[PDB]
Symmetry: D2
Subunit: 225 residues, 4 copies
């Protein structure tokens, strides 16, 4: 297999976190096509549910392997497979709340499964804010800028994000991320953009808090000639 | 003429500004095709030259009429013509320097000329920073998010910008802008992106500090289906 | 009169500015004792009045000469008298509005007075925010950190400010300032604090928008032994 | 022993954290007089040592009980003793690194001691920055602003911090904290300042990374009459 990836893989997730003192554990699975940058993620709160904060704050913690890259842009993430990569991000919300998340991605070639482990921590969500009042519905499609740090062979991501609200409003978050291959890269990409679409569908029931996330991402260069 | 615009117009510019106490006046002219979002700008420092700061900090102050919009996205700027529009922006650089700029755009239909008047103010550029050491070469292509403020019938722009440096480095700037039509809008667009390419070519000589700016901009929605 | 200053002086003030396109000019006078860091400032809007934005945003633009300095901390400001000094400041309000201001202080020993000239520019105050709704009452007492920049013989100021609102809230501003002596410093101070008290008393009437500002400022080191 | 506190107490500390994927655990003890806001904290890295990042980033995670409060300002922290209180904080370093920390303070009246439990997480410290190069020496004395949030009976802390570097520079951090009594407040304080002095004395050896922290903190109102 090239880098051990196939166009129909499974995923396994485990996230441990704490927001304003509330601890939780989430587990899930999923399926996706890394070559088309599309994935389906099924999550369930196994500890700490029901969450007192909007689950949308956690969505972007659940894998750049799921990015459709054109041949003209180096694909740092798939080149890091099957060992995988790690990433660290800060979430700065406009009302002062701050979150930080980190994850480790590994490909289990024999199982055709991607193992994802993450940690998510957040503080100072206001009691009257949209996250504690569960006023959010989904993140708006975005355009992230990816920049190479050639001296360390790592990438930096910059994306101004917006969580859409039930009353028609919007809530801004600045995502600053560092992406690090586990394998020393033999090539580094030039800067580029990654456009993303991420959607959440609640699937909770009387017994468990659960939902599905669907992400589609594609890398590109400037649209201007 | 529709909104008084044609595909081969001229422009007239006048900017008055002050950066860290250094006053200056710039005048220029240009030509462009608003329907293809392309423009050529010729500037000359008529007061305060030679500028002690990199002229690249001023480039984005020189007109969303020059944006190619698809029929599926409301074109707030051309709809504001010929009266025009005004805009206000803050420039926050990573080393603490801050700039603010404002402009007024008007179309002179009989002259087939767009009149642009602007003001630019900046403070606290470090003496050892890339702007005072004139280490910049050009802004990197970007993707700006445009958001409607329906209750005020104005638009908000958000774009993380990067000035490229002569040693291969980059210098970040966050642009926050408010766009306001002079004519009450009869329609408002939905959110969208505006991709931009802006280039500078020095054309100074022993008598004057002068340069040419070339901008190309196109509006779009998410690339993901 | 040390450095051309006395303990009973007068001041002349002139401010020219523009906020979101609204131009204005303020004229005023004042009296105070720089040795006790205490001053009385009488201002009047003679152009652009009545201001469409809260006049409290302009209050800290009206002179570190008025700072009680103890024997043990170097007084950077009085030391440059009577030539004076210049300063440049920026601050970003929590709702995204950004202002930049600069001033020029000159001591007129012949008339035992101070001439103060400043410019104030600001952008993107939300129509529904406290500044445009003119819902402010006063700045809360603060503690600014002053840090020396030895290789340039200039000073950096850092103070987190809070504008109290008629409705009980607090509106935050971050003040970042650079202070520069017009006469080259032979001595530089080490870091220190500058506590300030600034109050606004409205004195408007049918003819003019006008008010009085009262500032009391004292320099100090840490309160802990 | 008012609120179960004495003027000669001991403390037990335990911190679990992770910075950019590096996990660690610190164990320690201490002594101090909460009435004089003075404490001695002895810490040891028992897991993850030696730390690859500067241990100074962790120092303010180790108790407002240790704050000299004058008669005229309400002491929110001692008032919740002996149950204790909890706090949540974030700060973004000037180079983009972001940390979040939380602690739990409990008074053990039976043994006249304090139990402190905390967690510290941080991300995106640049490999070439002062934290990863372990080039820091100490935090500079500060002045934190404490503001009440009456409808929630909690407090907000705002302090601009500066980590001094071995090479002479200063590395800035913005601390945003929310303070919460575990026992419901019957009285709330009005805004006030809290000046702090925090020093680190390295005590490492061939076996362990360890040090002593000494904090002195005093509450006050404005220095101006």
């Amino acid at each position: 297999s090239a880098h051990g990836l196939t166009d129909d893989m499974t995923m396994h997730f485990r996230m441990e976190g704490c927001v304003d003192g509330h601890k939780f554990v989430i587990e899930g699975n999923g399926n996706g096509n890394p070559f088309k940058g599309k994935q389906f993620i099924n999550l369930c709160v196994i500890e700490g549910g029901p969450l007192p904060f909007s689950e949308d704050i956690l969505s972007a913690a659940f894998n750049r392997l799921f990015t459709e890259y054109p041949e003209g842009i180096v694909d740092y993430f798939k080149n890091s497979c099957p060992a995988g990569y790690t990433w660290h991000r800060s979430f700065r919300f406009e009302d002062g709340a701050v979150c930080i998340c980190s994850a480790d991605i590994t490909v289990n070639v024999r199982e055709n499964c991607i193992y994802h482990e993450s940690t998510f921590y957040g503080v100072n969500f206001p009691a009257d804010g949209p996250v504690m009042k569960k006023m959010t519905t989904n993140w708006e499609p975005s355009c992230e800028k990816i920049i190479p740090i050639n001296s360390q062979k790592i990438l930096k991501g910059d994306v101004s994000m917006y969580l859409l609200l039930k009353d028609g409003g919007r809530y801004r978050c600045q995502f600053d991320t560092i992406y690090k291959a586990k394998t020393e890269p033999k090539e580094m990409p030039d800067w580029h953009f990654i456009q993303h679409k991420l959607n959440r569908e609640d699937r909770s029931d009387a017994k468990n808090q659960k939902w599905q996330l669907i992400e589609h991402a594609i890398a590109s260069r400037s649209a201007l000639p």
